[PDB]
Scaffold this active site. Structure first.
Site, PDB file in Angstrom:
ATOM      1  N   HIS A  41       0.807  -1.213   0.000  1.00  7.59           N
ATOM      2  CA  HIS A  41       0.000   0.000   0.000  1.00  7.59           C
ATOM      3  C   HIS A  41       0.843   1.267   0.000  1.00  7.59           C
ATOM      4  O   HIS A  41       0.276   2.363  -0.080  1.00  7.59           O
ATOM      5  CB  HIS A  41      -0.957  -0.004   1.196  1.00  7.59           C
ATOM      6  CG  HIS A  41      -0.343   0.482   2.473  1.00  7.59           C
ATOM      7  ND1 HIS A  41       0.162  -0.373   3.430  1.00  7.59           N
ATOM      8  CD2 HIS A  41      -0.176   1.733   2.963  1.00  7.59           C
ATOM      9  CE1 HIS A  41       0.626   0.332   4.446  1.00  7.59           C
ATOM     10  NE2 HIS A  41       0.434   1.612   4.188  1.00  7.59           N
ATOM     11  N   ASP A  88       0.028  -7.497   2.208  1.00  8.80           N
ATOM     12  CA  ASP A  88       0.504  -6.126   2.031  1.00  8.80           C
ATOM     13  C   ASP A  88       2.033  -6.123   1.985  1.00  8.80           C
ATOM     14  O   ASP A  88       2.726  -5.616   2.869  1.00  8.80           O
ATOM     15  CB  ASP A  88      -0.026  -5.231   3.143  1.00  8.80           C
ATOM     16  CG  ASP A  88       0.350  -3.775   2.950  1.00  8.80           C
ATOM     17  OD1 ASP A  88       0.707  -3.398   1.814  1.00  8.80           O
ATOM     18  OD2 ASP A  88       0.289  -3.009   3.936  1.00  8.80           O
ATOM     19  N   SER A 173       4.932   2.597   7.783  1.00  5.32           N
ATOM     20  CA  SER A 173       4.541   1.508   6.898  1.00  5.32           C
ATOM     21  C   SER A 173       5.723   1.062   6.047  1.00  5.32           C
ATOM     22  O   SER A 173       6.499   1.884   5.551  1.00  5.32           O
ATOM     23  CB  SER A 173       3.377   1.943   6.002  1.00  5.32           C
ATOM     24  OG  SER A 173       2.328   2.527   6.760  1.00  5.32           O
ATOM     25  N   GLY A 174       5.857  -0.253   5.880  1.00  8.65           N
ATOM     26  CA  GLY A 174       6.955  -0.819   5.129  1.00  8.65           C
ATOM     27  C   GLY A 174       8.235  -1.011   5.910  1.00  8.65           C
ATOM     28  O   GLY A 174       9.148  -1.685   5.414  1.00  8.65           O
TER      29      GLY A 174
END
Ligand SMILES: *[C@@H]1O[C@H](CO[C@@H]2O[C@@H](C)[C@@H](O)[C@@H](O)[C@@H]2O)[C@@H](O[C@@H]2O[C@H](CO)[C@@H](O[C@@H]3O[C@H](CO[C@H]4O[C@H](CO)[C@@H](O)[C@H](O)[C@@H]4O)[C@@H](O)[C@H](O)[C@@H]3O)[C@H](O)[C@H]2NC(C)=O)[C@H](O)[C@H]1NC(C)=O
Ligand SMILES: *[C@@H]1O[C@H](CO[C@@H]2O[C@@H](C)[C@@H](O)[C@@H](O)[C@@H]2O)[C@@H](O[C@@H]2O[C@H](CO)[C@@H](O[C@@H]3O[C@H](CO)[C@@H](O)[C@H](O)[C@@H]3O)[C@H](O)[C@H]2NC(C)=O)[C@H](O)[C@H]1NC(C)=O
Ligand code: CQH
Length: 218
Positions: A41, A88, A173-174
């Site tokens: 995402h 994800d 995120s990530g």
């Protein structure tokens, strides 16, 4: 990271910053000299041609000679469901190979299928937001977390900061989740806002994708 601490300079040489014209937006993990992995995402909604992969960084406010910057050459997904944030995970092939030094190194991944039991101690990190009216991080943050299976899908690895309101946030995120020196998770999503104290932070289970990751980076 909310409620974390400053990381030691270049303590985690596999940490990656994804940026759009100098502006940080997600984290990633160097899994090969020409491969990073992040949350799907993060790249699904940005202009990939403008994404820059920043390696060997620590303080994003300052010029850093230790930095190596690359562009994205190809994208690899594995059944990414954007509606439920299932799978994800995304692998980004770089337009070149990184130079391995003291500040830039390849991360270690666990074995396919490896499950983390309830209560395992891990370490989250990232350059994300610092909390409500706390701004954004300039120096890399890290945070001690505990793996939990409660309030967590079987398709996720969830962590919780026991005893106080703390956790990952937007911009984290990530980023990797390091457990026993292995990258077991990729920061995916929170619930009830950052550092809610009600829901655990959900990570993408890297161990469930090792066969697919190897089939690309080998
Ligand atoms: C907050 O988190 C830190 C760091 O978390 C650890 O490291 C990261 C990378 C992840 O792998 C996490 O899963 C880890 O928990 C904790 O510091 C660690 O504390 C433990 C004790 O609980 C230390 O373990 C010691 O390890 C000695 C050997 O060190 C070498 O091997 C270990 C792996 O076994 C390796 O992590 C380390 O870097 C060395 O390579 C061993 O002789 C000794 O008996 C003991 O087992 C570990 O060394 C610490 N790591 C660091 C980087 O300081 C904090 O304890 C944690 N806080 C709280 C309150 O628990
Ligand atoms: C792999 O990709 C990187 C990054 O490319 C940059 O980011 C992309 C998202 C796009 O916006 C690209 O248009 C953009 O260039 C390449 O690194 C970049 O290479 C160029 C050309 O070599 C560099 O330009 C030079 O910059 C120096 C200053 O360091 C000037 O003195 C020069 O006059 C010239 O302008 C550019 O700086 C560099 N990027 C960074 C952050 O250093 C890389 O070359 C490329 N590799 C391959 C093999 O294609
Ligand atoms: C928020 C960052 C603002 C920004 C800064 C610098 C440069 C560009 C942007 N602004 C985008 O970056 C936007 C963000 C949106 C949420 C508005 N995003 C795109 O411009 C974009 C471009 C191409 C594609 C193609 C597809 S379609 C698919 O399914 N997967 C892809 O990569 C998607 C988004």
């Amino acid at each position: 990271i909310v409620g974390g601490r400053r990381a030691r300079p270049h303590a985690w040489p596999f940490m990656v910053s994804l940026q759009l014209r100098g502006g940080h937006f997600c984290g990633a993990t160097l899994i090969a000299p020409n491969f990073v992995m992040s949350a799907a995402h993060c790249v699904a909604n940005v202009n990939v041609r403008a994404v820059r992969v920043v390696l060997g960084a620590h303080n994003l406010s300052r010029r850093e000679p230790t930095r190596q910057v690359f562009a994205v050459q190809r994208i690899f997904e594995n059944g990414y469901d954007p509606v439920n944030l299932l799978n994800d995970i995304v692998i980004l092939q770089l337009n070149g190979s990184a130079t391995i030094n003291a500040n830039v190194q390849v991360a270690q991944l666990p074995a396919q299928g490896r499950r983390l039991g309830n209560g395992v101690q891990c370490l989250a990190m990232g350059w994300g937001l610092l909390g409500r009216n706390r701004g954004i991080a300039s120096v890399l943050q890290e945070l001690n977390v505990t793996v939990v299976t409660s309030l967590c899908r079987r398709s996720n690895v969830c962590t919780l900061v026991r005893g106080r309101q703390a956790g990952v946030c937007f911009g984290d995120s990530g980023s990797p989740l390091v457990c026993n020196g292995l990258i077991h998770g990729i920061a995916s999503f929170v619930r009830g806002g950052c550092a809610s104290g009600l829901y655990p932070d959900a990570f993408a289970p890297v161990a469930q994708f090792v066969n697919w990751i190897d089939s690309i980076i080998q």
